[PDB]
């Protein structure tokens, strides 16, 4: 409810086994409670296994399978690891919450989707403002530290499917104080 209700979460990322650093994000629980809760639970793994997939609901070990130079990096697919998988802690996908937050600045954390009301576990971190994505993707967080590890990942050499050649893995993830 209050701005003091905002939680912090972390992602320790490795590129081909070499530690790139830590990405810390502040979740706007007071503006997008369901989306932030889903994300926070996926970082800690404290919600169990997927209802439909029967797989662990948590980012540990998953990758950033898509990076777009000058725009964003995408991850969160813990079931298929290529953009076709992932699952929310609510079972399957969940509805879009009110589009309060906007892509009005770089390093905003937003939900990836496959059309209206199709939120799962996939997300993306932008690197420039993107107002055209407003009212399509639910913004629920902001990177507060480690924005340089985000750009490091973003500029990695990719193939024609926009997939990084190197293995970008979430070594550790969880909650911060």
Got the DSSP string for 92-148? S-BPPPP--S---SSSEEEE--SSTT-B-S-EEEESS--GGGTTTS-EEEEEEE-HH
**How remote is the C-alpha of 41 from its chain's centroid?**
12
Task: Report the distance separating Cα 122 and Cα 64, nearest Å.
Answer: 10
Q: Strand pairing of 139-145 and 168-176?
A: unpaired
Please pick, among 7, 34, 103, 137, the residue that the annotation labels catalytic: 137
Active site residue 122: no
Q: Strand pairing of 18-27 and 139-145?
A: antiparallel
Number of residues that make up the chain: 177
Active site residue 140: no
Query: Which DSSP helix (H) or strand (E) runs through 41?
Result: helix 33-44
Q: How many domains does the chain have?
A: 1
Tokens of 13: 């990322």
Please pick, among 19, 71, 135, 165, the residue that the annotation labels catalytic: 71
Please pick, among 113, 134, 147, 172, the residue that the annotation labels catalytic: 113
Q: In the β-sheet with 66-68, what is the strand arrangement from edge to edge?
A: 66-68, 72-75, 123-126, 108-111, 139-145, 18-27, 7-15, 168-176
Active site residue 94: no
Q: For residue 1, which of 26, 27, 31, 36 has the smallest C-alpha distance?
A: 31
Active site residue 58: no
Helix (H, G, I), strand (E, B) or coil at 11: strand
Task: Report the distance separating Cα 103 and Cα 31, nearest Å.
Answer: 14
Please pick, among 6, 133, 147, 172, the residue that the annotation labels catalytic: 133
Active site residue 135: no
Task: Report the distance separating Cα 1 and Cα 32, nearest Å.
Answer: 10
Task: Report the distance separating Cα 114 and Cα 138, nearest Å.
Answer: 13
Q: Which domain holds residue 23?
A: 1-177
Tokens of 54: 């029967």
Structural biology method used? X-ray
What CATH number did the domain enclosing 139 receive? 2.40.100.10
Active site residue 66: yes
Resolution of the coordinates in A? 2.0
Please pick, among 29, 37, 38, 74, the residue that the annotation labels catalytic: 74
Please pick, among 34, 65, 66, 103, the residue that the annotation labels catalytic: 66
Sign of torsion, CA 125 128 131 133?
Answer: negative
Tokens of 60: 């540990």
**How remote is the C-alpha of 59 from its chain's centroid?**
9
Q: Strand pairing of 7-15 and 18-27?
A: antiparallel
Active site residue 113: yes
Tokens of 37: 């809760």
Task: Report the distance separating Cα 153 and Cα 168, nearest Å.
Answer: 8
């Amino acid at each position: 409810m209050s701005k003091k209700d905002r939680r912090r979460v972390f992602l320790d990322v490795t590129i081909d086994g070499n530690l790139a650093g830590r990405i810390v994000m502040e979740l706007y629980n007071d503006i997008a409670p369901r989306t932030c809760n889903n994300f926070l639970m996926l970082c800690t793994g404290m919600a169990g296994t997927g209802k439909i997939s029967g797989k662990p609901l948590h980012y540990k070990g998953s990758t950033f399978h898509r990076v777009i130079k000058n725009f964003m990096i995408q991850g969160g697919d813990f079931t298929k690891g290529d953009g076709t998988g992932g699952e929310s802690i609510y079972g399957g996908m969940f509805d879009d919450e009110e589009f309060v937050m906007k892509h009005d600045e770089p390093f905003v954390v937003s939900m990836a989707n496959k059309g209206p009301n199709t939120n799962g576990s996939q997300f993306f971190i932008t690197t420039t403002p993107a107002p055209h994505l407003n009212n399509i993707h639910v913004v629920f967080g902001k990177v507060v530290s480690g924005q340089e590890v985000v750009t490091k990942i973003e500029y990695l050499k990719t193939n024609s499917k926009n997939r990084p050649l190197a293995d970008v893995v979430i070594l550790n993830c969880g909650e911060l104080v």
